[PDB]
């Protein structure tokens, strides 16, 4: 994929002309990883990594020679100064130009100040000065981009080399260091601490071109306006600390919101997760109250932080006005006079040095501090203790064989008992050694010592040959199954087909789409544990070393395939292979040609299976121990009157900005047309200060008002969205996962709260400044309106042409970045397997090929943005040229003030135009947040919580519940679930439910609570359920859910969230489940704050809590579901006895998976695949041998069925015959 950057000229590499073809393709179709362009040979990850590693090794070597700490920063500087001195040369040129061009502005204006139409010599000199002005702006606009590319390229190169050394080191970490670190800490300095290098370079050069320029400019100012410059200059310096006390006060209001944003997001997580429980309990007004309180207390801090941000941005807007105003007030007051050449040079000098001092120099300071911190982190990571490379082997005679003598080892230099105690045994070719021992013996550590991963303390280990190893936990990397097996070995058809058949892989391959070519990412997302183990075994077989180690291979797989693998591969294929096995299944020990027993780190006995049969020790004995979106985003914030006032306030701010400099222009003109006489100073300074103050106040007012309106729009959108997600029917929560729903509450509203109202105000600010500049140049030279239409059409078409590719290549440098982190993860988790094979260097090449695929989209993201900015500055330079020259070919009409104003504003168009366009892109990029928030504010809604027909207070009087032809569906057009459900429930009876899993057992609760408005009728005490609103239907029915949940809060809440009960009642209820005592030993009485789902509580305890809830509600209906799944039998019978003897006079339906739970129930639904068929007393249904109840009783067993039938008969005979 050749790179046209390689075959291009200089006249082609300045205008990035090599990149037009890609853009053309980008205009037709979408871009893929083929359309991309490969990288230069001077940028492949391997080359940079090798070079920087060379310098880093030299530097640490000299550190050892000198006994002082090695510094990575010195290595980076030593490898990169020779190539970062060139870019310094050019930024020196660029700063000199930004300082020179005001002086030629001065000379042009000075020609206008002494206009004489006949002195054509002066006209020719002024034309020369304008030509020099356009040369300066054309080296500031066209040759500043073949520079910025390389300044970002030095940062790219540094970062890619750093990533390569980081992976290289993390591939050879000693286990002692490996354990003390993590694998989240070795991806956090490759995803977030090696990105700083992509940015520090961009600004590094301003640590010396920042101050130097701020002196050069000062000197120039001194030559023109004299001492007064200091006055103005003083103010500029004050913007350095004031900018860093809007930062150590905004960072105290921005990390005092996380303690509220995260509370709200966590409460979201609980509300969205357990929404079926909240709806069934009819609680969501409580969570609505909680979330309203949290959201209001984060809007307080969002509103303070945004008011402060707006004040900062208005200071940035009006700083230039205040500098110029104080400069020229001091300039005039010391007794000098205003002429139009010094005024509009000094303005431009202040423009340049303000853009450097207040914006670029502090940014470079921040970014160099961040890159130094990151270099320190990678510095520490590169000094972790390594692994002894496999050293000079003892001279052998070609006998591949394993022998260990008197081996003792520790995993810690502080452990008392050694991991191994003097182990001395061996294995030869063809001898399938095996290890037998319960968990805690050290067999895993035994194989680890075999691999050398455990440092020998005494004895000796002699392993001579290629080693194939299998970890206890199978490990799969990002790649296809054939590539998974090959692990770098070239494919061989027969040697792979025998692998396929001996591993019994055919079933799994026929399951998946690509046969054996299905791509398997990290953690085996496309595989199962048995598949992982089998593919790991296949890798071990195909790598085909001498000595093989197999640790617990067959435990997690089926018996037959495990037998096949052990017999026709381990017993058969490996009978000619050195092998060590750690096992847990006894049947295979007969096939072990040797047996090793390990215990307490000490050898117990070695021998064949026969000698341990004769030993008298059975193994088991040992083994046991669009535009509409903008309109909706703006309508929410305020009514349109405030919006029209907002527009007038923007316009007043901009117009007063422009009119201040216009006032200097008019002042200068009124000084020229003079004469001693003087000029009335009080009037002029009065209006000058009036215009400056109007600029400042209108800037502050515009910024605060825009922030307030957009923050208020965020608040209104969130309140609407949330109060419309609490009312969405559970069907919606089923369609959308928990991840996406709670993503538009944390990330999206996360934008809408603090990044639209800042990007959308910055965009408005600089857009109105661009319009200010263009309208000044059109009010002076009206003819400019003609060429400036072919700089509107060209601009719009340019931006369309460019955003159709900068949106196809700013997703390629994102969807090819993750594979780097994924490969790093998959290689650290499989680390022992990798380092067991001598092929760790091949994983280095895989990392590079995953890093020459992100440094291949960073290349395009760095040069397509430049192909855009070169052209934008061609447009801005055409404008500056037209203003500079067209101000002369019409010299007869203009004057010094008009020309100064028009020209210096055109000079500031540079850069301001580009920031305006960049924010336009970013705002159109973050209105997707608003589009999603507004997509949720328009969801479905279940029936309203209240109806006109409120129920009688005593209702339900008894508990009569009648199902009349209830036909219920989960979703429209789906399978009919309950079909003609016609049943009667007379007061207080206990009705079990029987059926198949999902055959309608758990749908009766779904329809009875109207979780999906059912078809049919349900009468609760002769009242239709559909005819009453929900919270007058769910408040009057209790339920015991499958998995109880406790909602984060005081235990006073998880029982009485509405504060409708009193401490005596709560204590009594908790007593009825006998857990009252179990609570009154916690820090608080009830008010112990809890973790998720009451993690300090047990499942049985949670069930007790919900049973207490049911007791507290004391309504005369009740529904139980999945009483005890795996709860301990004591708590089982506990809950059972409270279930009967607590709720005798409260109608009970029970939906249980077992029979003893429901054997004694008064009646039983029988649900036949979504159909009620049998419903009567259990004894009657057992009388008929053909009843499904009889059949499913008989399916348990003989003694079980006899006991159950006896119990049902006992109930019948005690009940119906007194
Ligand atoms: O109203 C100023 C807002 N801010 C401060 C907010 O944090 C701001 N930040 C910039 N940066 C952010 C990212 C790291 C530092 C730069 C930045 N960068 C450029 N440049 C890149 C143009 O594409 C010039 C360098 O090429 N130009 C800027 N202007 C803005 C318009 C008037 C003056 C030119 C500018 N402004």
886 marked among binding-site residues? no
Q: Residue 19 gets which letter from DSSP?
A: G
Q: Residue 978 gets which letter from DSSP?
A: E
Cβ proximity of 68 and 138 under 8 Å? no
> How many angstroms separate the CA atoms of 629 and 643, rounded?
16
151 Cα: distance to centroid of ligand 1 (angstroms)? 17
**Is residue 1187 left, alpha or beta, with left meaning phi > 0 and alpha meaning psi from -120 to 50?**
beta
Q: Measured from the CB, is residue 363 less than 6 Å from ligand 1?
A: yes
915 Cα: distance to centroid of ligand 1 (angstroms)? 6
Other CB atoms within a 10 A radius of the CB of residue 154 amount to 20
Nearest to 694 by CA among 666, 716, 725, 663: 663
The CB-side HSE value for 328 (13 A sphere, CA atoms) comes to 31
**Is residue 788 left, alpha or beta, with left meaning phi > 0 and alpha meaning psi from -120 to 50?**
alpha
1136 Cα: distance to centroid of ligand 1 (angstroms)? 70
Resolution (Å units) = 3.4
471 marked among binding-site residues? no
Q: Measured from the CB, is residue 915 less than 6 Å from ligand 1?
A: yes
999 marked among binding-site residues? yes
Q: Measured from the CB, is residue 766 less than 6 Å from ligand 1?
A: yes
* 915, 917, 919, 921: residue to mutate for ligand 1 pocket, most atoms within 8 A of CB: 915
The CB-side HSE value for 296 (13 A sphere, CA atoms) comes to 6
772 marked among binding-site residues? no
Q: Name the residue at shortest CA distance from atom 28 of ligand 1.
A: 915
Q: Show the DSSP H helices in 742-857 as ranges.
A: 748-754, 756-780, 793-803, 812-815, 818-829, 831-836, 841-851
Other CB atoms within a 10 A radius of the CB of residue 675 amount to 6
Q: Which of ligand 1's atoms lies nearest the C-alpha of 203? A: 15
Cβ proximity of 1086 and 1004 under 8 Å? no
Which residues are paired to 549 by β-bridges?
469, 580
Q: Name the residue at shortest CA distance from atom 24 of ligand 1.
A: 911
* 242, 911, 918: residue to mutate for ligand 1 pocket, most atoms within 8 A of CB: 911
1154 Cα: distance to centroid of ligand 1 (angstroms)? 69
Q: Name the residue at shortest CA distance from atom 18 of ligand 1.
A: 915
441 marked among binding-site residues? yes
438 marked among binding-site residues? yes
> Which residues have a Cβ under 8 Å from the Cβ of 596 and sit 6 or more positions away?
425, 433, 434, 435, 436, 603, 606
> How many angstroms separate the CA atoms of 330 and 324, rounded?
10
Q: Measured from the CB, is residue 355 less than 6 Å from ligand 1?
A: yes
Residue with tokens 């020719």: 124
Task: Tell me the residue range of the domain where 607 lies.
Answer: 401-623
* 149, 359, 364, 907: residue to mutate for ligand 1 pocket, most atoms within 8 A of CB: 359
CA distances from 281 to 269, 286, 1035, 1147, 1186 (A): 18, 11, 7, 17, 39
> Which residues have a Cβ under 8 Å from the Cβ of 673 and sit 6 or more positions away?
none
Nearest to 434 by CA among 210, 593, 610, 643: 593
> How many angstroms separate the CA atoms of 1179 and 378, rounded?
75
Nearest to 57 by CA among 393, 366, 549, 386: 386
Q: Measured from the CB, is residue 462 less than 6 Å from ligand 1?
A: no
Q: Measured from the CB, is residue 911 less than 6 Å from ligand 1?
A: yes
C-alpha Rg value of the chain to the nearest Å: 40
> Which residues have a Cβ under 8 Å from the Cβ of 828 and sit 6 or more positions away?
170, 183, 186, 187
Cβ proximity of 799 and 27 under 8 Å? no
Q: Which of ligand 1's atoms lies nearest the C-alpha of 766? A: 31
Q: Name the residue at shortest CA distance from atom 5 of ligand 1.
A: 359
CA dihedral 494, 500, 502, 508 (to 10 degrees): -170
Locate 1166 and state its tokens: 């029988």
> Which residues have a Cβ under 8 Å from the Cβ of 293 and sit 6 or more positions away?
none
Q: Name the residue at shortest CA distance from atom 8 of ligand 1.
A: 359
Q: Name the residue at shortest CA distance from atom 31 of ligand 1.
A: 912
367 Cα: distance to centroid of ligand 1 (angstroms)? 15
Q: Measured from the CB, is residue 145 less than 6 Å from ligand 1?
A: no
Q: Measured from the CB, is residue 914 less than 6 Å from ligand 1?
A: yes
Is residue 538 packed enough to be buried (19+ CB in 10 Å), middle (13-18) or exposed (0-12)? Answer: buried
Other CB atoms within a 10 A radius of the CB of residue 1105 amount to 23
> How many angstroms separate the CA atoms of 224 and 230, rounded?
12
> How many angstroms separate the CA atoms of 909 and 904, rounded?
9
The CATH number for 509's domain is 3.40.50.300
Locate 977 and state its tokens: 């679930």
> How many angstroms separate the CA atoms of 485 and 483, rounded?
5
Q: Measured from the CB, is residue 912 less than 6 Å from ligand 1?
A: yes
444 marked among binding-site residues? yes
Scored b (16 or more CB within 10 A) or e, 1164-1199 reads bbbbeebebebbebbbebbeeeebbbbeebeeeeee
Q: Measured from the CB, is residue 312 less than 6 Å from ligand 1?
A: no
> How many angstroms separate the CA atoms of 463 and 426, rounded?
10
765 Cα: distance to centroid of ligand 1 (angstroms)? 12
531 Cα: distance to centroid of ligand 1 (angstroms)? 54
> How many angstroms separate the CA atoms of 990 and 993, rounded?
10
Q: Measured from the CB, is residue 669 less than 6 Å from ligand 1?
A: no
Residue with tokens 């390629």: 812
Q: Show the DSSP H helices in 282-432 as ranges.
A: 284-333, 340-355, 361-381
> How many angstroms separate the CA atoms of 1015 and 970, rounded?
11
359 Cα: distance to centroid of ligand 1 (angstroms)? 7
Q: Measured from the CB, is residue 438 less than 6 Å from ligand 1?
A: no
Residue with tokens 């049902």: 1208
1002 marked among binding-site residues? yes
Query: 3-state DSSP call for residue 405?
Result: strand
- What method did the depositors use to determine the structure? cryo-EM
Q: Residue 35 gets which letter from DSSP?
A: T
> How many angstroms separate the CA atoms of 611 and 589, rounded?
12
Taking each helix axis from N to C end, the angle separating 640-672 and 756-780, rounded to the nearest 10 degrees, works out to 40
Pairing of strands 1172-1176, 1015-1020: unpaired
Q: Name the residue at shortest CA distance from atom 26 of ligand 1.
A: 911
CA dihedral 618, 619, 621, 622 (to 10 degrees): 130
364 Cα: distance to centroid of ligand 1 (angstroms)? 12
> How many angstroms separate the CA atoms of 729 and 969, rounded?
13
Q: Which of ligand 1's atoms lies nearest the C-alpha of 918? A: 23
Cβ proximity of 165 and 382 under 8 Å? yes
204 Cα: distance to centroid of ligand 1 (angstroms)? 16
């Amino acid at each position: 994929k050749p790179n046209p950057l390689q075959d291009a000229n200089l006249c082609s590499r300045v205008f990035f002309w090599w990149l037009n073809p890609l853009f053309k393709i980008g205009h037709k179709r979408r871009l893929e990883e083929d359309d991309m362009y490969s990288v230069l040979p001077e940028d492949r990850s391997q080359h940079l990594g090798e070079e920087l590693q060379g310098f880093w090794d030299k530097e640490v070597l000299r550190a050892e020679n000198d006994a002082q700490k090695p510094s990575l920063t010195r290595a980076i500087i030593k490898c990169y100064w020779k190539s970062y001195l060139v870019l310094g040369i050019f930024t020196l040129i660029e700063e000199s130009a930004k300082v020179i061009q005001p002086i030629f502005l001065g000379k042009i204006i000075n020609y206008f100040e002494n206009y004489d139409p006949m002195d054509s010599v002066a006209l020719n000199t002024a034309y020369a000065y304008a030509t020099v002005l356009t040369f300066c702006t054309l080296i500031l606009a066209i040759l500043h981009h073949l520079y910025f590319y390389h300044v970002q390229c030095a940062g790219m190169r540094l970062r890619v080399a750093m990533c390569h050394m980081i992976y290289r080191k993390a591939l050879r970490l000693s286990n002692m260091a490996m354990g003390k670190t993590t694998t989240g800490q070795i991806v956090n300095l490759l995803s977030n601490d090696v990105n700083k290098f992509d940015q520090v370079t961009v600004f590094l050069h301003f640590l010396w071109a920042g101050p130097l320029q701020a002196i050069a400019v000062t000197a120039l100012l001194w030559m023109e306006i004299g001492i007064s410059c200091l006055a103005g200059m003083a103010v500029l310096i004050i913007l350095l600390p004031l900018q860093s006390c809007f930062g150590k006060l905004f960072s105290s209001l921005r990390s005092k919101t996380a303690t509220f944003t995260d509370a709200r997001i966590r409460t979201m997580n609980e509300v969205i997760t357990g929404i079926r429980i909240i709806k069934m309990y009819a609680w969501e007004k409580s969570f609505s109250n909680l979330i309203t309180n949290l959201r209001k207390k984060e809007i307080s801090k969002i509103l303070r932080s945004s008011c402060l941000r707006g004040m900062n941005l208005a200071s940035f807007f009006s700083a230039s006005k205040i500098i110029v105003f104080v400069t020229f007030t001091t300039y005039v007051l010391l007794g000098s006079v205003i002429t139009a050449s010094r005024v509009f040079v000094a303005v431009t000098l202040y423009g340049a040095v303000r853009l450097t001092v207040t914006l670029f120099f502090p940014s470079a300071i921040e970014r160099v501090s961040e890159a130094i911190v990151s270099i320190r982190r990678i510095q520490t990571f590169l000094l972790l203790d390594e692994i002894s490379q496999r050293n000079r082997q003892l001279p052998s005679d070609g006998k591949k064989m394993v022998h260990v003598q008197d081996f003792t080892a520790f995993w810690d230099k502080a452990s008392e008992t050694p991991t191994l105690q003097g182990l001395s045994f061996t294995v030869r070719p063809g001898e399938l050694l095996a290890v037998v021992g319960p968990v805690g013996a050290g067999k895993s550590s035994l194989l680890s010592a075999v691999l050398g991963e455990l440092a020998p303390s005494h004895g000796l280990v002699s392993v001579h040959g290629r080693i194939a190893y299998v970890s206890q936990q199978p490990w799969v990397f990002s790649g296809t199954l054939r590539s998974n097996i090959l692990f770098g070995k070239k494919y061989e058809k027969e040697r792979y087909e025998k692998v396929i058949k001996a591993c019994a892989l055919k079933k799994d391959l026929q399951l998946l789409e690509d046969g054996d070519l299905t791509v398997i990412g990290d953690r085996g997302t496309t595989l199962s544990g048995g598949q992982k183990a089998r593919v790991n075994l296949a890798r071990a077989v195909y790598q085909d070393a001498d000595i093989y180690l197999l640790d617990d291979p067959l435990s997690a797989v089926d018996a037959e395939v495990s037998r096949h693998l052990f017999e026709l591969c381990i017993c058969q294929i490996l009978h000619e292979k050195i092998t060590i096995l750690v096992t847990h299944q006894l049947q295979y020990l007969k096939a072990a040609s040797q047996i090793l027993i390990l215990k307490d780190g000490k050898m117990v006995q070695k021998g064949t299976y026969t000698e341990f049969l004769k030993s008298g020790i059975d193994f088991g004995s040992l083994l046991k121990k669009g535009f509409q979106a903008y309109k909706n985003y703006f309508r929410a914030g305020a009514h349109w009157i405030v919006f029209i006032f907002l527009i007038l306030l923007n316009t007043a701010a901009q117009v007063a900005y422009v009119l201040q400099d216009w006032w200097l222009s008019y002042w200068a003109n009124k000084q020229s047309m003079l004469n001693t006489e003087k000029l009335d100073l009080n009037w002029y300074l009065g209006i000058y200060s009036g215009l400056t103050v109007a600029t400042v106040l209108f800037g502050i007012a515009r910024s605060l008002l825009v922030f307030y309106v957009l923050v208020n729009s965020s608040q209104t959108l969130h309140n609407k969205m949330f109060e419309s997600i609490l009312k969405a029917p559970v069907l919606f929560f089923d369609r959308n996962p928990i991840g996406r729903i709670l993503n538009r509450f944390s990330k999206d509203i996360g934008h809408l709260d603090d990044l639209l109202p800042l990007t959308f105000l910055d965009f408005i600010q600089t857009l109105l400044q661009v319009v200010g500049v263009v309208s000044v140049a059109v009010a002076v030279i009206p003819w400019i309106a003609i060429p400036l239409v072919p700089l509107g059409i060209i601009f719009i078409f340019l931006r369309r042409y460019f955003l159709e590719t900068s949106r196809d290549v700013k997703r390629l440098e994102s969807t090819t970045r993750s594979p780097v982190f994924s490969h790093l993860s998959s290689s650290l988790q499989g680390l022992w397997t990798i380092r067991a094979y001598k092929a760790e260097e091949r994983c280095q090449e895989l990392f590079d090929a995953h890093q020459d695929l992100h440094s291949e989209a960073w290349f395009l993201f760095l040069t397509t943005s430049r192909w855009f900015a070169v052209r934008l500055d061609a447009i801005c330079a055409m404008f500056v040229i037209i203003v500079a020259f067209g101000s002369l070919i019409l010299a007869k009409t203009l004057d010094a003030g008009q020309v100064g104003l028009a020209l210096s504003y055109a000079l500031t168009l540079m850069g301001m135009f580009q920031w305006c366009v960049r924010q336009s892109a970013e705002v159109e990029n973050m209105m997707i947040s608003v589009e999603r928030v507004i997509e949720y504010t328009d969801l479905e809604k279940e029936a309203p919580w209240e109806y006109q027909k409120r129920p009688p207070p005593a209702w339900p009087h008894e508990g009569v519940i009648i199902f009349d032809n209830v036909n219920f569906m989960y979703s429209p057009g789906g399978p009919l679930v309950l079909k003609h459900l016609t049943a009667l429930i007379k007061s207080q009876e206990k009705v079990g439910i029987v059926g198949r899993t999902g055959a309608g057992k758990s749908s009766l609760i779904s329809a009875l609570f109207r979780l999906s408005e059912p078809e049919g009728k349900i009468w609760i005490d002769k009242i239709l359920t559909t005819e009453i609103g929900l919270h007058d239907l769910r408040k009057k029915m209790s339920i015991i859910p499958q998995e109880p949940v406790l909602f984060t809060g005081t235990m006073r809440k998880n029982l009485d969230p509405f504060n409708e009960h009193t401490d005596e009642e709560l204590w009594n209820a908790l007593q009825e489940v006998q857990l009252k005592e179990t609570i009154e030993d916690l820090p608080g009485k009830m008010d112990t704050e809890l973790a998720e789902s009451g993690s300090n509580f047990s499942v049985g305890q949670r069930q007790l809590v919900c049973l207490a809830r049911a007791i507290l509600r004391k309504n005369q209906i009740l529904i139980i579901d999945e009483a005890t799944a795996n709860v301990d039998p004591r708590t089982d019978e506990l809950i059972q006895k409270k279930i009967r003897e607590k709720f005798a006079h409260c109608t009970v339906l029970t939906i249980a998976h077992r029979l003893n739970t429901i054997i004694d129930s008064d009646k039983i639904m029988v649900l036949d695949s979504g159909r009620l068929k049998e419903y009567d007393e259990p004894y009657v249904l057992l009388q008929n041998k053909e009843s499904l109840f009889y059949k499913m009783v008989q399916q348990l067993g003989k003694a079980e069925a006899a006991a159950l039938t006896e119990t049902a008969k006992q109930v019948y005979f005690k009940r119906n015959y007194p």
